[PDB]
Each structure stands twice: as structure tokens, then as C-alpha cells.
Design an enzyme around this catalytic site. Structure first.
Site, PDB file in Angstrom:
ATOM      1  N   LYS A   1       0.832  -1.199   0.000  1.00  0.00           N
ATOM      2  CA  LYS A   1       0.000   0.000   0.000  1.00  0.00           C
ATOM      3  C   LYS A   1       0.867   1.250   0.000  1.00  0.00           C
ATOM      4  O   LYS A   1       0.473   2.282  -0.543  1.00  0.00           O
ATOM      5  CB  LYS A   1      -0.888   0.041   1.244  1.00  0.00           C
ATOM      6  CG  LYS A   1      -1.854  -1.120   1.414  1.00  0.00           C
ATOM      7  CD  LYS A   1      -2.506  -1.027   2.787  1.00  0.00           C
ATOM      8  CE  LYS A   1      -3.497  -2.149   3.033  1.00  0.00           C
ATOM      9  NZ  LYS A   1      -4.132  -2.044   4.381  1.00  0.00           N
TER      10      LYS A   1
ATOM     11  N   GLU B   1       8.072   2.063  -5.660  1.00  0.00           N
ATOM     12  CA  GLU B   1       8.084   1.641  -4.263  1.00  0.00           C
ATOM     13  C   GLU B   1       8.152   2.845  -3.318  1.00  0.00           C
ATOM     14  O   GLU B   1       8.604   3.926  -3.704  1.00  0.00           O
ATOM     15  CB  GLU B   1       9.271   0.699  -4.026  1.00  0.00           C
ATOM     16  CG  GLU B   1       9.385   0.107  -2.622  1.00  0.00           C
ATOM     17  CD  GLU B   1       8.242  -0.828  -2.253  1.00  0.00           C
ATOM     18  OE1 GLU B   1       7.086  -0.365  -2.147  1.00  0.00           O
ATOM     19  OE2 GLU B   1       8.504  -2.029  -2.034  1.00  0.00           O
ATOM     20  N   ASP B   2       7.692   2.660  -2.084  1.00  0.00           N
ATOM     21  CA  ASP B   2       7.813   3.699  -1.066  1.00  0.00           C
ATOM     22  C   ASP B   2       9.214   3.733  -0.445  1.00  0.00           C
ATOM     23  O   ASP B   2       9.798   4.808  -0.285  1.00  0.00           O
ATOM     24  CB  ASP B   2       6.756   3.508   0.024  1.00  0.00           C
ATOM     25  CG  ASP B   2       6.794   2.118   0.637  1.00  0.00           C
ATOM     26  OD1 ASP B   2       7.330   1.190  -0.009  1.00  0.00           O
ATOM     27  OD2 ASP B   2       6.281   1.952   1.764  1.00  0.00           O
TER      28      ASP B   2
ATOM     29  N   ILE C   1      13.167   1.482   0.478  1.00  0.00           N
ATOM     30  CA  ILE C   1      14.085   0.370   0.341  1.00  0.00           C
ATOM     31  C   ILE C   1      14.880   0.283   1.643  1.00  0.00           C
ATOM     32  O   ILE C   1      15.459   1.277   2.106  1.00  0.00           O
ATOM     33  CB  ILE C   1      15.085   0.562  -0.853  1.00  0.00           C
ATOM     34  CG1 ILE C   1      14.425   0.978  -2.195  1.00  0.00           C
ATOM     35  CG2 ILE C   1      16.037  -0.638  -0.974  1.00  0.00           C
ATOM     36  CD1 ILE C   1      13.037   0.461  -2.478  1.00  0.00           C
ATOM     37  N   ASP C   2      14.874  -0.893   2.255  1.00  0.00           N
ATOM     38  CA  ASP C   2      15.713  -1.124   3.414  1.00  0.00           C
ATOM     39  C   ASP C   2      16.830  -2.090   3.035  1.00  0.00           C
ATOM     40  O   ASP C   2      17.846  -1.674   2.485  1.00  0.00           O
ATOM     41  CB  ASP C   2      14.896  -1.652   4.592  1.00  0.00           C
ATOM     42  CG  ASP C   2      15.592  -1.431   5.921  1.00  0.00           C
ATOM     43  OD1 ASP C   2      16.827  -1.266   5.930  1.00  0.00           O
ATOM     44  OD2 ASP C   2      14.908  -1.418   6.964  1.00  0.00           O
TER      45      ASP C   2
ATOM     46  N   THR D   1      13.278  -7.418  -0.630  1.00  0.00           N
ATOM     47  CA  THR D   1      11.936  -7.414  -1.205  1.00  0.00           C
ATOM     48  C   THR D   1      11.964  -7.157  -2.708  1.00  0.00           C
ATOM     49  O   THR D   1      11.272  -7.823  -3.479  1.00  0.00           O
ATOM     50  CB  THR D   1      11.039  -6.352  -0.526  1.00  0.00           C
ATOM     51  OG1 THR D   1      10.816  -6.718   0.841  1.00  0.00           O
ATOM     52  CG2 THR D   1       9.699  -6.236  -1.231  1.00  0.00           C
TER      53      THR D   1
ATOM     54  N   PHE E   1      12.926   4.950  11.658  1.00  0.00           N
ATOM     55  CA  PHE E   1      11.605   4.517  11.218  1.00  0.00           C
ATOM     56  C   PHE E   1      10.736   5.733  10.912  1.00  0.00           C
ATOM     57  O   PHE E   1      10.431   6.529  11.802  1.00  0.00           O
ATOM     58  CB  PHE E   1      10.940   3.625  12.268  1.00  0.00           C
ATOM     59  CG  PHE E   1       9.701   2.931  11.774  1.00  0.00           C
ATOM     60  CD1 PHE E   1       8.456   3.525  11.912  1.00  0.00           C
ATOM     61  CD2 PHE E   1       9.782   1.685  11.170  1.00  0.00           C
ATOM     62  CE1 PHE E   1       7.312   2.890  11.457  1.00  0.00           C
ATOM     63  CE2 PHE E   1       8.645   1.043  10.714  1.00  0.00           C
ATOM     64  CZ  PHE E   1       7.408   1.649  10.853  1.00  0.00           C
ATOM     65  N   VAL E   2      10.351   5.876   9.648  1.00  0.00           N
ATOM     66  CA  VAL E   2       9.555   7.019   9.218  1.00  0.00           C
ATOM     67  C   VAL E   2       8.133   6.599   8.846  1.00  0.00           C
ATOM     68  O   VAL E   2       7.891   5.456   8.460  1.00  0.00           O
ATOM     69  CB  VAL E   2      10.210   7.752   8.026  1.00  0.00           C
ATOM     70  CG1 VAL E   2      11.536   8.363   8.441  1.00  0.00           C
ATOM     71  CG2 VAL E   2      10.412   6.806   6.858  1.00  0.00           C
TER      72      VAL E   2
ATOM     73  N   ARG F   1      -0.911   6.594   7.289  1.00  0.00           N
ATOM     74  CA  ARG F   1      -1.018   6.681   5.834  1.00  0.00           C
ATOM     75  C   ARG F   1      -1.762   7.961   5.456  1.00  0.00           C
ATOM     76  O   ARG F   1      -1.476   8.570   4.424  1.00  0.00           O
ATOM     77  CB  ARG F   1      -1.712   5.453   5.233  1.00  0.00           C
ATOM     78  CG  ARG F   1      -1.001   4.125   5.483  1.00  0.00           C
ATOM     79  CD  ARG F   1      -1.345   3.119   4.397  1.00  0.00           C
ATOM     80  NE  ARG F   1      -1.098   1.733   4.791  1.00  0.00           N
ATOM     81  CZ  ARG F   1       0.031   1.072   4.549  1.00  0.00           C
ATOM     82  NH1 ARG F   1       1.041   1.675   3.931  1.00  0.00           N
ATOM     83  NH2 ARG F   1       0.158  -0.191   4.935  1.00  0.00           N
TER      84      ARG F   1
HETATM   85  N1  3L3 Z   1       6.610   2.974   7.452  1.00  0.00           N
HETATM   86  C1  3L3 Z   1       7.919   2.365   7.409  1.00  0.00           C
HETATM   87  N2  3L3 Z   1       8.021   1.059   7.136  1.00  0.00           N
HETATM   88  C2  3L3 Z   1       9.263   0.445   7.085  1.00  0.00           C
HETATM   89  C3  3L3 Z   1      10.415   1.208   7.323  1.00  0.00           C
HETATM   90  N3  3L3 Z   1      11.500   0.347   7.210  1.00  0.00           N
HETATM   91  C4  3L3 Z   1      11.034  -0.891   6.916  1.00  0.00           C
HETATM   92 BR1  3L3 Z   1      12.097  -2.503   6.643  1.00  0.00          BR
HETATM   93  N4  3L3 Z   1       9.676  -0.852   6.839  1.00  0.00           N
HETATM   94  C5  3L3 Z   1       8.806  -2.001   6.531  1.00  0.00           C
HETATM   95  C6  3L3 Z   1       8.567  -2.274   5.038  1.00  0.00           C
HETATM   96  N5  3L3 Z   1       8.230  -3.652   4.626  1.00  0.00           N
HETATM   97  C7  3L3 Z   1       7.237  -4.192   5.535  1.00  0.00           C
HETATM   98  C8  3L3 Z   1       5.776  -3.984   5.141  1.00  0.00           C
HETATM   99  P1  3L3 Z   1       4.480  -5.004   5.954  1.00  0.00           P
HETATM  100  O1  3L3 Z   1       4.637  -6.482   5.520  1.00  0.00           O
HETATM  101  O2  3L3 Z   1       3.153  -4.505   5.534  1.00  0.00           O
HETATM  102  O3  3L3 Z   1       4.610  -4.895   7.516  1.00  0.00           O
HETATM  103  C9  3L3 Z   1       7.676  -3.619   3.254  1.00  0.00           C
HETATM  104  C10 3L3 Z   1       8.663  -3.682   2.076  1.00  0.00           C
HETATM  105  O4  3L3 Z   1       9.691  -2.764   2.054  1.00  0.00           O
HETATM  106  C11 3L3 Z   1      10.970  -3.185   1.673  1.00  0.00           C
HETATM  107  C12 3L3 Z   1      11.966  -3.463   2.780  1.00  0.00           C
HETATM  108  P2  3L3 Z   1      13.558  -4.339   2.327  1.00  0.00           P
HETATM  109  O5  3L3 Z   1      14.340  -3.499   1.387  1.00  0.00           O
HETATM  110  O6  3L3 Z   1      13.250  -5.707   1.653  1.00  0.00           O
HETATM  111  O7  3L3 Z   1      14.407  -4.606   3.643  1.00  0.00           O
HETATM  112  C13 3L3 Z   1      10.258   2.608   7.611  1.00  0.00           C
HETATM  113  O8  3L3 Z   1      11.371   3.413   7.855  1.00  0.00           O
HETATM  114  N6  3L3 Z   1       9.033   3.146   7.644  1.00  0.00           N
HETATM  115 MG    MG Z   2       7.700  -0.969  -0.240  1.00  0.00          MG
END
Ligand code: 3L3
Ligand code: MG
Ligand code: 3L3
Ligand code: 3L3
Ligand code: 3L3
Ligand code: MG
Ligand code: MG
Ligand code: MG
Ligand code: MG
Ligand code: MG
EC number: 2.4.2.8
Lengths: 203, 197, 202, 201
Positions: free
Chosen positions: D65, D119-120, D122-123, D127, D170-171, D183
Site C-alpha cells: 500500500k 516503491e515507497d 528500500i531497506d 523485497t 523509522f519514518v 497513511r
Molecule cells: N513505514 C515504514 N516502514 C518500514 C520502514 N522500514 C522498513 Br524494513 N519498513 C517495513 C517495510 N516492509 C514491511 C511492510 P508489511 O509487511 O506490511 O509490515 C515492506 C517492504 O519494504 C521493503 C523493505 P527491504 O528493502 O526488503 O528490507 C520505515 O522506515 N518506515
Molecule cells: Mg515498499
């Protein structure tokens, strides 16, 4: 000749839109919605850049009614210029008409320049006729006129702008910086004034 | 007090934003992004209505540099007035300062809208003229306020950003009539500083 | 309120009067509802929505794909209201396709003010079906906002709670409404030319 | 381009300088990236996308989302370019990732197309490395990734378009969530401790 609004156009119910409460009783119908004005202005900006983009432009705002159209037209022009391969710098100036021009730079800033005059409305066209005369004495490279609205009227001296937003019937409209006794400038839509509104804000 | 921009603020690389082509080598950095100004102005609009919304407002634009801030501040105020209503009529006028009849200001809430305040002398001068005509209230909104010991002490009522003592252009602020056609507030490059003089 | 009524004989607008995506120049006939008009109507709908639903946590449900533009802009106006008002309510969002595909477990709807956001109502059968499913998860309330509603004999008589525009029985594209996945990348609602209809025909 | 680099010692902005939802007033610590700044960066990213991916048919893929807002605005800027220039066509699809691909059209639609993944954040990059690894065996003409945010962290990938490179914080906001909340917020912000506790799952 721009977007044609026919004599029979009903306009829109006020309750279908967001309207400032202090004018709730003062308007009859919404005549031209703000968003429609934006859409039309976006295209006008492109026509302007096409016709006048080859040389430095001096944009001349005719206060007060012209201020909203002027600001938005210039924002669309700026949007074009920061996303294109090529553009020309623009200078702005502001004037008020009284057949006398008040305020603004020495009109020698216009010579050699591409002058765009921005009005809110053309009616008889006499106001523009006079202004163009004063401007052309300073020998600018080019003078064009953009007016948001042009009225169909048996009083027009024949004058027509180079850029027109909307061609409207001879009704009295307010909003989008157009005023009735200084009122209704703080309204985003162009609207038709009610009878009670006309009596309440009469001088 | 406004958004405090420190003296060591690097600003932004021009290549990271959309910049008008004809100013590409005339600017050094983006100082305040257009959208950040919009966000700050939205909050200022709400602050203005909390303070001045009780009575008819005359919005007074100080041309030329104030015109952009003026238009956007009024757009945000209008959004509040048509979506939470609860509202007050507003009139507008425009003035230029060279170094309508001011009776129209009498008995009204006058908001003076300015691009930048440096020493504050210009504003103090304008205020002394306005107050001759007895408005119900006078307030000043300034997009930028410079941090400088050259300040005479005047503080405006509504401040967008408090910036260091740097020359900035953009968002209607000019350098010899240039850079008004630019949405970001930026710092001028040496090349641009000698081309438009 | 049936929303903004567009009559059967509305001619729409000449394409040359507006900025139109260049790859669709020959593929369109007329502009039917300019993007800006959609924005203005959507702003009022946002206020109408908060008036009725702002008393409790709202779950906004986007019906993909055609509902995504209206959904994003309606929520933007709602958020504008929420950050400029004295008090507001949390809103969560989810996205579903109707074949219900995707989306979170519908138990997330339980006890919430559910706002369903659609691009277009025609017969109303799609919404009636969805509504009869959603109710079984016991939301606090459930409402439907549709950008467009068609005047058709085919109507089973379902009317949504919020309507942008009531339009005639014509096929329209734009503002995320598609013709075989095309025309979603268009801000205006428009009517498709004979040229484009044959050119993008499946 | 690594995008707009936001340094580790970035203090962000006081909430009181911005318009902020009252229901989150005690739940946020600082504004990190103002909505308007996101717009300005996105505008430029749109021109970058079109320079690199136009002109062949582009399929824009939104990762729901979190990506939906950045997706909607990036595409709006792309459309502004397409209607005010010379030459430019896009189709859109929406996918969700299960911890698999859920929803979406059959990925055969991607074959021989210019695929932009949106994408929103990248960590670890896992993914998306896994996603790209899937998309490619449907043989697209090219595949590019636009991500609003890239975090500085141990990373097993580099996207082609980046809005902002941010510290390991964490943002939330701008469709980025904390247990489905935040959101409905236009700015990207840092979550307060009371906000963590309140919306804790
Ligand atoms: N809002 C927010 N979310 C963050 C953040 N870091 C991560 Br990890 N996440 C989690 C993202 N992930 C978890 C989503 P869900 O299964 O619905 O709980 C989604 C995918 O993003 C990609 C992370 P990756 O590059 O694979 O380590 C952040 O800084 N802010
Ligand atoms: Mg994402
Ligand atoms: N708001 C509004 N104003 C209208 C309208 N028609 C005219 Br004329 N005007 C007035 C235009 N006039 C303003 C003078 P004042 O009323 O003393 O400030 C002059 C503007 O220029 C165009 C008129 P002209 O072409 O010379 O007949 C209208 O429909 N709406
Ligand atoms: N663009 C820009 N202009 C600046 C700046 N600082 C000053 Br002072 N100025 C000049 C302000 N002045 C420009 C007049 P002009 O020569 O006709 O354009 C107008 C008055 O501003 C108020 C300064 P003050 O508070 O009285 O010391 C700046 O940082 N940027
Ligand atoms: N672009 C466009 N589309 C229209 C229009 N009318 C209908 Br019906 N549709 C189709 C809506 N449908 C398209 C789904 P699919 O084709 O299987 O991927 C979705 C459901 O719409 C609701 C119709 P209903 O109220 O149940 O009769 C229209 O005027 N324009
Ligand atoms: Mg006029
Ligand atoms: Mg007048
Ligand atoms: Mg000043
Ligand atoms: Mg639909
Ligand atoms: Mg379809």
C-alpha cells in the site's frame, strides 16, 4: 476565441461546490468553476510560450482584477520552462488604469521586449485600445494580450485579444479576483451575483 | 518565529530539482524548495485566521517581491474559508514602496504581506503611514526574515522562514528584476551575479 | 443530491482548448469533464464525507483500478480538512479488485466507518453485491462514493451515498477509467473517437 | 544519482511550524520530509523517468500500500509532461507482496514493455531484488525501479530513481505506515514514543 459559454448556460448549483459561507446568500450560480479556469489556463500558457517564447518577455499585470489570472498563467508558464529544453527569462510588472496608467516601471523597460498584457476581462475593448496605444509608442518587439474573459457585446469597438480563456455572455460575473465594489475577489470560482448580494454590497 | 534556517545550511544541489533552463548556470544552490514554502504558508494561513479572522480583512500586498507569497497565502486562506465556515470577507489592495486611498484601511483588520524583512526599516516606515488611518488592527506577514545585527528590532507577526544573512532570489524575489520567474528560493552564483548587473 | 447533472446533449469541449496527452490526440473525440471540474466537485464531496462519516475511524476502500485517481484525490481533500480543523479522525486505507481479490481480512472493517470509493456506477449490481458482503463483517456504517453515475434503464435502482457527476449512457475514458487498459494516463474524462476505438480494440 | 541525501544528524522540523492532523499531534516527534519537498523532488524524478524510459510503452507498477501516494503523484507529473510536450503511453497495474505476488494482472502484460516499479521505501533491498528476479523471467524490454526512500543500512540493491536517501530511522506518512496508521498524513515524519505505544500491535 477560447471556450465558448453560450447565453443559455445555466451554470452550476452552489451546493455542488465548496463556497465561502460569507457569500452563501450573495451568489446566484457558479458560472465558471476554478478548476476549469486552471485547465484552460494551462493550455493558454503553452500557446503563449509558442508565440512569445523566442525572446525576453515582460509580463504586465493589470491590477486588481488581473492578479489571479496573471499569477496562475505565470505558474503554468514557469512549469513549462523548468521541464523543457529551452526557455527565455521573464520580467514582471504591475499597472493600474485610471486613460492614465498608475504605478509600474518606466515604460522604457518595454522597448525591445516581448510584452504580454494580462487582463481579467474585455468588454467594450476601449480600456485595452487605450493601453495598447500607450505601450506601442515605446516600440516593444511585440505586444500580445491575454484576457481570461471576453464578453460578447454589441458595444465592442472591434478589439479582440490574442489569448482568450473564455468567451462569455454579457452577464455581470465576480470571483477569481473579479469584483463588485471590491467584494468577491476572495472567491476561487467565477460566479453570477445574486440580487440580494447586489443590494447588500452596493455603495 | 518561523522555520529557522541555520548559517551553515548547505541548501540543495540544483540537479536534484526542476530548474528553469535559462537560470541553470546563474544559480548556485536551491535554498528553500518551492513546496517547503507552500507547506509553511499553509500553516501561516491558519495562524492568520486564528488571529485576524474575527473581522473584515484587508490584505495588502507589497509589490513586487511580495506578489507570489501574497497569492499563495490568500489561496490557503480561501481554502480555509470555504471548507470550515465559519468565515470572514476579505478585500485586497496592492502598493509599491519608492525610496487605494488609505482611508479604506480605517476600522479594518489590515494584513501587510511582504517578501523579506532585513533591517525592518521599510516595514516600520510603512506601518507608521498605515497607522495614521486608524485600522482596527495591523499585522505583518513576511515570508523571509533575515538574521542580522543590522535589525533595528522590528519583529513581524507572521514569519515563514528565518534565514542567514545571504542574498536570496526566487519566489518573486529579484536581482535587478531577474529570478522572479523562479518557484524556488535560491542563492545566486557568481556567474549569474555578473550577468544580470 | 444526484451530483452534477450532465445532460444527454452536452457537447463537451473541443480538444484544442485544453492540454491533451499527445499520443491520444487522434484517439479522443471531445473532453467530457475537465480534470479541474472533477477537482472542484471532489473538494465538496470530501466535506460531505467528513460531515457524515467523520465521527469515527474511517476505512477508505479503493476499488481498483479505475477508482484509484478519484480515491487519491478525494483522500487528499479529506486530509486537507483534517490538518486544518480543530478535531479530526484517523483514516486507514485498503485496496480491492472485484472479479473480492486482494485486500486485508475483512475483519479489519468491523466497527469502522467504511467508505467504498468507486469510479463508476452503471447498473449498481457490483456495489449491491459488495455491500451485502461488507455488512456481514458488521461495520459501524458503510457508504459508497462514486465519481460517476450513469443514467441507464439497466439500473436496479442502487444509488450511492456520494456522487460526483450524473452522466448520460455513453462510454467515457480518462481519470483512470480505461478502454482495454488505455486512457488511464489521462486527467480529463473524455469520449473516445472512432479512430481510437478501433485502434485500441481488443 | 543517490537522490536528496538527508544526513544522519538531520533534526527535522518542529511539528508546530506545519499543518498536522490533530489526531497525530502527540504521536509524531518531528517532520522529516515536508510534503511539498517530496513534490518538488518527484517533479524532477518524473523528467528523469521520461528521459530514460520514454519512448516505448511504459507499464507502471505500484507496490501497495505504501507506494500508492508516490505512485499517484509521480504519474501526475509524468502526465503533465506528456500533455505539454512533443511526443510521449502508460498502462498501470497494482501489486501487493506477501511474506509472493498477490493481485495484479498476469505478468505476461510486462513482456516486451518498459516496466517502472514504484516503491515507497528500500531497506535491505531484499523485497525488490526478489521482485526483479521474478519480473525479468517475463522478459520485459527493460525494468526500472523508482523508490521514494532509500535507507542507509546493510543492503544485500540500488534503485534507478531515488527521491531521498535517509538515515536508519523509522519514518511514517505519505502512505508509509506504522501498523496501518499514518497513511493519512501528507508529510513524512518520525514517529514519537507515545505513538509507538499507542498504535502498537
Ligand atoms: N513505514 C515504514 N516502514 C518500514 C520502514 N522500514 C522498513 Br524494513 N519498513 C517495513 C517495510 N516492509 C514491511 C511492510 P508489511 O509487511 O506490511 O509490515 C515492506 C517492504 O519494504 C521493503 C523493505 P527491504 O528493502 O526488503 O528490507 C520505515 O522506515 N518506515
Ligand atoms: Mg515498499
Ligand atoms: N467583476 C466584473 N467587472 C466588470 C464586468 N464587466 C465590466 Br465592463 N466590469 C468592469 C471593468 N472596468 C473596471 C472599472 P471599475 O468598475 O471602476 O473598477 C474596466 C475593465 O476593462 C474592461 C472594460 P472595456 O472593454 O473598456 O469596456 C463583469 O462582468 N464583472
Ligand atoms: N532578492 C533579494 N532582495 C533583497 C534581499 N535582501 C534585501 Br535588504 N533585499 C532588497 C529589498 N528591497 C528591494 C528593492 P529593489 O532594488 O527595487 O528591488 C526592498 C525592501 O526590503 C526590505 C529591507 P529592510 O527590512 O527595510 O532593511 C535578498 O536576500 N534577496
Ligand atoms: N472506462 C469506462 N468503463 C466503463 C464504463 N461503463 C462501464 Br459498466 N464500465 C466498466 C466498469 N467495469 C469494468 C470491469 P472489467 O471490464 O471486467 O475489467 C467495472 C464495474 O463497474 C460497475 C458496473 P455496474 O454498476 O455493476 O453495472 C464507462 O462509461 N467507461
Ligand atoms: Mg480588466
Ligand atoms: Mg473593479
Ligand atoms: Mg519586502
Ligand atoms: Mg470501477
Ligand atoms: Mg475497464
Amino acid at each position: 476565441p477560447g471556450v465558448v459559454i453560450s447565453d443559455d448556460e445555466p451554470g452550476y448549483d452552489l451546493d455542488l461546490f465548496c463556497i465561502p459561507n460569507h457569500y452563501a446568500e450573495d451568489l446566484e450560480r457558479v458560472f465558471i468553476p476554478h478548476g476549469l479556469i486552471m485547465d484552460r489556463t494551462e493550455r493558454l500558457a503553452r500557446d503563449v510560450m509558442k508565440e512569445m517564447g523566442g525572446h525576453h518577455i515582460v509580463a504586465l499585470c493589470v491590477l486588481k482584477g488581473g492578479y489571479k489570472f496573471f499569477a496562475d498563467l505565470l505558474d503554468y508558464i514557469k512549469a513549462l520552462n523548468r521541464n523543457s529544453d529551452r526557455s527565455i527569462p521573464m520580467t514582471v510588472d504591475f499597472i493600474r488604469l485610471k486613460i492614465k496608467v498608475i504605478g509600474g516601471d518606466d515604460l522604457s523597460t518595454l522597448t525591445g521586449k516581448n510584452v504580454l498584457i494580462v487582463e481579467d476581462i474585455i468588454d467594450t475593448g476601449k480600456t485595452m485600445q487605450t493601453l495598447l496605444s500607450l505601450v506601442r509608442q515605446y516600440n516593444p518587439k511585440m505586444v500580445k494580450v491575454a484576457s481570461l474573459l471576453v464578453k460578447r457585446t454589441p458595444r465592442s469597438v472591434g478589439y479582440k485579444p490574442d489569448f482568450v480563456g473564455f468567451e462569455i455572455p454579457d452577464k455581470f460575473v465576480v470571483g477569481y479576483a473579479l469584483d463588485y465594489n471590491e467584494y468577491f475577489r476572495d472567491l476561487n470560482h467565477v460566479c453570477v451575483i445574486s440580487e440580494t448580494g447586489k443590494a447588500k454590497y452596493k455603495a
